[PDB]
């Protein structure tokens, strides 16, 4: 039963990136101010924070495997910190332009970064963070990268050039390019995590959200309702719903079967920029980052 409860919200500078730890009640936020925070959302106490740089930090993920966080910023750099000690693990220039998005491979020591330099790059931490592959083909800022959880030898990039490209590790060209018809570009791409549907989802400045069948390349549905740029849209890992956030300042929960809006939330923190869902669906936790801070919600 959809019974949405606010677990924890705090105010901060604009949060551009967000992620859940899989075994600790922690959420990571990365801010436009160059700061990153790890909050325990149940005790409502800060566990660790770092002033990483002076530029926006747009991307941040836990690497629970290694007790790390990995972050990417407008100063062109990827940095990794141990969250137990605060020690900096590595610090390198990844792209000659903004880093928009970082994805972590679930079983292999690989990280993907998407950039305004028109590329996605693959880094290998068991090979001294060497650059192992550059994926070229996009024609505008690549805004989002995501592994297929059902087959992480492939991944998707969403780009302001109005396309999504799907790639295989070890190969130089996309397996396919999706021409979305979202003419103001693609800000976000996500996979449906379960094996019954070959679905992907995209969000755009053109105010639409689109669902795709990645086998036929067809648009299954178009979700309209937001009144300003849609920053993200994701499938929930366990609940039959879709969650989106917009510069109109709302989160929307859509029925994933009928594609109708079930609930619109204005959490009162201005524009919404980022989203995370708890990897195992614990308390059906979700978290979103906004102009004025973040909120962690229990959906049911």
């Amino acid at each position: 039963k959809l019974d949405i409860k606010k677990t924890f919200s705090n105010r901060s500078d604009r949060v551009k990136g967000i992620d859940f730890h899989p075994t600790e009640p922690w959420v990571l936020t990365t801010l436009y101010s160059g700061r990153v925070e790890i909050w325990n959302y149940e005790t409502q106490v800060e566990v660790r924070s770092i002033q990483v740089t002076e530029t926006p930090v747009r991307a941040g993920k836990f690497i629970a495997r290694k007790n790390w966080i990995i972050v990417g910023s407008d100063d062109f750099r990827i940095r990794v910190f141990n969250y137990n000690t605060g020690e900096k693990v590595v610090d390198f220039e990844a792209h000659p332009d903004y880093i928009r998005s970082i994805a972590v491979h679930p079983t292999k020591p690989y990280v993907l970064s998407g950039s305004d330099d028109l590329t996605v790059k693959l880094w290998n931490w068991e090979n001294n963070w060497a650059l192992e592959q550059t994926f070229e083909g996009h024609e505008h800022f690549v805004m989002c990268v995501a592994f297929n959880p059902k087959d992480p030898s492939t991944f998707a990039s969403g780009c302001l050039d109005r396309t999504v490209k799907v790639w295989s590790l070890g190969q130089s060209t996309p397996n396919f390019t999706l021409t979305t018809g979202q003419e103001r570009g693609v800000n976000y791409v996500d996979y449906y995590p379960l094996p019954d549907k070959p679905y992907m989802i995209t969000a755009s400045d053109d105010l639409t959200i689109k669902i795709w069948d990645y086998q036929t390349k067809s648009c299954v549905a178009t979700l309209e309702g937001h009144m300003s740029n849609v920053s993200f849209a994701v499938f929930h890992p366990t609940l039959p719903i879709i969650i989106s956030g917009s510069e109109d300042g709302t989160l929307k929960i859509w029925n994933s079967s009928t594609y109708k809006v079930e609930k619109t939330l204005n959490v009162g923190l201005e524009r919404s920029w980022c989203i995370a869902t708890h990897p195992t669906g614990r308390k059906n936790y979700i978290a979103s980052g906004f102009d004025n801070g973040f909120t962690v919600l229990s959906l049911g």
Binding site: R14, Y32, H140, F141, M143, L160
Partner: peptide, 5 residues
């Protein structure tokens, strides 16, 4: 710069 914010 698109999407500066």
């Amino acid at each position: 710069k698109s999407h500066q914010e």
